[PDB]
């Protein structure tokens, strides 16, 4: 839930400074790079992909953050803060296969944007994923709450007339990003 | 490898109260002291009195699965083959011995000279019969 809050917040909160954002990206890629380095070995071992809920959760948040704020992560040179080009690919091809277990609509939007930015190419991994589907296992008794939890974004737009107007100064609508 | 064979001649074929199984009593033609009692699915292998049956007990054939392309085994040499367990041995006299087999309930009792039945152990075994 926090990770959803975290990702939604960074994306939406207009008054955030470039560096506070890079701060959150730098925390997430850092925490993520460690997860894959210390844990990838546990996947072909006994258990399910649920053992790694928390991994996907964080990777979602980071992907989500990239959707709304990718234009910021290019420094003066045109290089990527946090080596996002090199970093995303590594996770996408990892054994966790984030693309399969995270929210479907975000993973899709990240694909679109990431591909556009020469940052990562996920679209073949997606193809492979829903092909294997028609023909990496997780119960579904508990797999749904997760899909549920990953669908909720606490700072998706408001629908209260006044509050909305009041928030405008503090909000980034998707159209803006 | 093979543990026992002999040609037996059937004395009696009793259908009891069943209609697929018969109890066979038969004596060896080679040993005066070797006799046999055996339940047989006679629907798959009919037997009449005075028939002569060759009877082989073997430890293996040279786990079970339906026959495939080009499988060959000791079973090929015979008409009727059963798999079962030895479950009792007994002294009948100073000279003779009897071993008891069960083939999922169809019972065999083989009595004979203790040297003639030397190779029989209390293990599992295949039974092979041909006419």
């Amino acid at each position: 839930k926090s990770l959803q809050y975290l990702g939604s917040y960074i994306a939406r909160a207009k008054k955030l400074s470039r560096t506070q954002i890079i701060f959150v990206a730098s925390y997430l890629t850092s925490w993520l790079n460690r997860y894959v380095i210390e844990r990838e070995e546990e996947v072909d071992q006994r258990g399910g992909m649920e053992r790694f809920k928390h991994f996907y959760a964080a990777f979602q948040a980071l992907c989500y953050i990239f959707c709304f704020r990718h234009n910021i992560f290019r420094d003066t040179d045109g290089n990527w803060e946090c080596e996002l080009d090199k970093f995303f690919q590594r996770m996408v091809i990892s054994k966790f296969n984030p693309l399969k277990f995270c929210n479907e609509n975000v993973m899709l939007m990240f694909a679109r944007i990431a591909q556009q930015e020469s940052v990562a190419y996920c679209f073949s991994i997606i193809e492979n994923n829903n092909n294997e589907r028609l023909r990496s296992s997780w119960s579904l008794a508990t797999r749904q709450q997760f899909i549920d939890l990953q669908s909720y974004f606490p700072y998706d737009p408001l629908f209260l007339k006044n509050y909305k107007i009041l928030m405008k100064e503090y909000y980034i609508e998707w159209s803006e990003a | 490898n093979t543990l026992f064979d002999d040609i037996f001649q059937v004395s009696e074929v009793d259908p009891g109260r069943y209609n697929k199984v018969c109890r066979i009593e038969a004596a060896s033609t080679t040993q005066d002291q070797c006799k046999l009692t055996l339940d047989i699915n006679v629907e798959l292998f009919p037997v009449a009195a005075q028939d002569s049956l060759t009877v082989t007990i073997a430890s293996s054939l040279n786990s079970w699965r339906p026959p495939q392309a080009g499988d060959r085994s000791l079973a090929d040499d015979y008409d009727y083959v059963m798999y079962g367990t030895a479950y009792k041995f007994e002294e009948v006299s100073k000279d003779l011995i009897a071993v008891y087999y069960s083939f999922g309930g169809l019972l065999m009792r083989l009595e004979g000279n203790y040297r003639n039945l030397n190779n029989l152990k209390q293990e599992n075994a295949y039974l092979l019969i041909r006419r």
Binding site: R135, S137, S139 | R65, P66, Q68
Partner: protein
């Protein structure tokens, strides 16, 4: 799609997938018996049977174990396909005999 029709019973399916149990909703002996007949003709199948937990829950349990050439899910598919083809053969034969009658 429809995801609620057939499911894997992961507590009786092996790691190598050469053995598995499936629970199919809304099916009794009709399909169950016919499907096991077909599946058992597949030479790589080592074991197969179906069962009906209870007459009051519409459920059908199929078990498949293979000798290791194909997975259990493969055998289910070949069986299902084999069954479809088998019906075609019957329909066509019946048609011809009605015409020729």
């Amino acid at each position: 799609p429809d995801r609620e029709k057939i499911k894997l019973l992961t507590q009786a399916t092996s790691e190598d997938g050469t053995s598995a149990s499936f629970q199919i909703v809304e099916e009794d002996h009709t399909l169950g018996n016919a499907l096991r007949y077909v599946i058992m003709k597949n030479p790589d199948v080592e074991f197969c049977g179906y069962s009906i937990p209870h007459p009051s829950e519409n459920l059908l349990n199929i078990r498949i174990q293979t000798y290791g050439e194909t997975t259990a899910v493969d055998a289910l598919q070949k069986g299902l396909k084999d069954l479809m083809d088998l019906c075609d053969v019957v329909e066509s034969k019946f048609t011809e005999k009605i015409k020729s009658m």
